[PDB]
């Protein structure tokens, strides 16, 4: 159907089918065990952020790789259940639609993860070249295949060069995995999210150290954002002033999975609505905090 | 009298193939993924269809995405699903299977979705005339004994060539199931059930448990790569060595492959010795392949 010009927030990244099993004790190899509870969930960073944007009242779209099959059918039906526009999905002829398997041991809270395989090709710069950008007001890219994503980012800048300031597409990038190839992405986007895990891997012991240490790597005018779980979040823009928001932990923490993606989607949402960096930071912390007291994303708004 | 009926579980198995079994608290990447229709009776139906036998599946399912995949998979294999006991609430069983590629060992995390089992009531509604063989995977024992009593009652009223052959599998070490030993022409007892009863080999389990079967019945015990044994009314222990592949890649459903192949071979008029051997042969070929494609 018809999508009004400059109305959608696009999230480019991974969609994964997560099979989560809760067990009394971790299984011994070669054995068959009955779990306490089993759950299928749509995962992936860009994919979770789309869920959150839809629930916040934002028209949103997901761009990522899928292969036809029963995994994709479940994932597409889940995206639709969450009101996510799925028209920009890069359908593949080869590889598996990603699926992960999590075993959570109830006697100690330990999680054993069997990560998806790497058979599915990522969204390429040539796949992105074929996308009409006019329907998007904001494009969020989850860092994965960095050298291809740089070309996608250069395409958006080129688009923006011919647009008046009110038709200019806002851009955000997330550097969540501690992989060297991704650090080139710091130099792209209006808003750069760097994870606590990436920061710690670079030897930074706080969000402040992380923002001050990495601000020299962002493009002129960009805002660098770093969430540090229950220590809240920080942002640093061109004025050199470090901004901070404390976390808003729930009375009882129920489920933290996708709290970081909730934060990213909420920050993007708040910025797209014309709110200040300080306001977006606080809003991001509030919604991530509310999510932590909830199973899944139902009731975050 | 043309079909082989298998009564039991249907499970959607979400399979991950790994280089080595993960250590607790670790994160590992898998080599490959796939979905497979599983469950003991359900796997035996796949094997029977591939062996050229008309077969039917009887088991519990609930409407949903899981059942849609399983039904399409049963249909794809030409397994008759008309006897499925559709339930109003729940999810249909699913599991997470970790298959270790270095040895073919499989580890299953099963979700028995609290779906009501097939009852004696559900089974009374079944037209037995189309079946030549009825295999029952032991689960809800007191309700399955009634199903088994219904088949004996049918057989009483029939000439010997029109009599339905019956097999029972006692796979889980649950006391409740041991009453099932006294029913069927062919009784399959697992290595896991045998070990739980303190038996250290297939020969010890067959000699120790033969007093529990019906008069004339054959007791069968497969012991994985040690092969399989059978003991009938003549008191002569029969053995078949296993047929291990040079590279074991996937063992999931090898036991069910054995049961289906034994049933198939016996339904074709072959001896117990020939059936054991055939069962070991097909189970062994399966172990060197991913899934059931190419077992024949
Ligand atoms: C995003 C940051 C800014 C404030 N936010 C926050 N992140 C938390 N966690 C736990 C753990 C989750 C795992 C995940 O994202 O999958 C990390 C982030 C927990 C909390 C709490 F205070 F509300 F508890 N807040
Ligand atoms: C059925 C017996 C008689 C010969 N058969 C045989 N069972 C094996 N296994 C591994 C493990 C599987 C797991 C499962 O059934 O899901 C058990 C049985 C392995 C082999 C092998 F020699 F070919 F390797 N043969």
Swiss-Prot record, chain A:
One of its GO terms (molecular function) is protein homodimerization activity. It is linked to Fructosuria: Benign defect of intermediary metabolism. Keywords: ATP-binding, Carbohydrate metabolism, Disease variant, Kinase, Nucleotide-binding, Transferase. Most abundant in liver, kidney, gut, spleen and pancreas. Low levels also found in adrenal, muscle, brain and eye. ATP binds at residues 111, 229-232, 258-261. Its EC number is 2.7.1.3. GO terms for biological process: fructose metabolic process; regulation of glycogen metabolic process; response to fructose; response to glucose; response to insulin; response to sucrose; response to zinc ion. The gene is KHK. Requires potassium. Inhibition by ADP. One of its GO terms (cellular component) is extracellular exosome. It comes from the Eukaryota. Pathway: Carbohydrate metabolism; fructose metabolism. The keyword Nucleotidyltransferase does not apply. Pfam families: PfkB. Signal peptide: none annotated. The lineage of its organism: Eukaryota, Metazoa, Chordata, Craniata, Vertebrata. It catalyses: beta-D-fructose + ATP = beta-D-fructose 1-phosphate + ADP + H(+). This is Ketohexokinase. Belongs to the carbohydrate kinase PfkB family. Beta-D-fructose binds at residues 18, 44-45, 48, 261. Catalyzes the phosphorylation of the ketose sugar fructose to fructose-1-phosphate. Homodimer. InterPro entries: Ketohexokinase-related (IPR052562), KHK (IPR034093), PfkB_dom (IPR011611), Ribokinase-like (IPR029056).
């Amino acid at each position: 159907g018809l999508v009004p010009r400059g109305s959608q927030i696009l999230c480019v990244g991974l969609v994964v089918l997560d099979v989560i099993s809760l067990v009394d004790k971790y299984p011994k190899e070669d054995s068959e065990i009955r779990c306490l509870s089993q759950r299928w969930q749509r995962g992936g960073n860009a994919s979770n952020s789309c869920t959150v944007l839809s629930l916040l009242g934002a028209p949103c779209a997901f761009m990522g790789s899928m292969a036809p099959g029963h995994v994709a059918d479940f994932l597409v039906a889940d995206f639709r259940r969450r009101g996510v526009d799925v028209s920009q999905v890069a359908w593949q002829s080869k590889g598996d639609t990603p699926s992960s398997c999590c075993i959570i041991n109830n006697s100690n809270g330990n999680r054993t993860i069997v990560l998806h395989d790497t058979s599915l090709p990522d969204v390429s710069a040539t796949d992105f070249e074929k996308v009409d950008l006019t329907q998007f007001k904001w494009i969020h890219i989850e860092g994965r295949n960095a050298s291809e994503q740089v070309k996608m980012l250069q395409r958006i800048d080129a688009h923006n060069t011919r647009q008046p300031p009110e038709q200019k597409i806002r851009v955000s990038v997330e550097v969540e995995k501690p992989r060297e190839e991704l650090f080139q992405l710091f130099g792209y986007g209006d808003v750069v999210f760097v994870s606590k895990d990436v920061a710690k891997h670079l030897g930074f012991q706080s969000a402040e150290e992380a923002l001050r240490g990495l601000y020299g790597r962002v493009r002129k005018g960009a805002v660098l954002v770093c969430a540090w779980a229950e220590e809240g979040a920080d942002a640093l823009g061109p004025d050199g002033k470090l901004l901070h928001s404390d976390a808003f932990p729930p009375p009882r923490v129920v489920d933290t999975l996708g709290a970081g993606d909730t934060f990213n989607a909420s920050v993007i949402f708040s910025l797209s609505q014309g709110r200040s960096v300080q306001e977006a930071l606080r809003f991001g912390c509030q919604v991530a905090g509310k999510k932590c007291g909830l199973q899944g994303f139902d009731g975050i708004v």
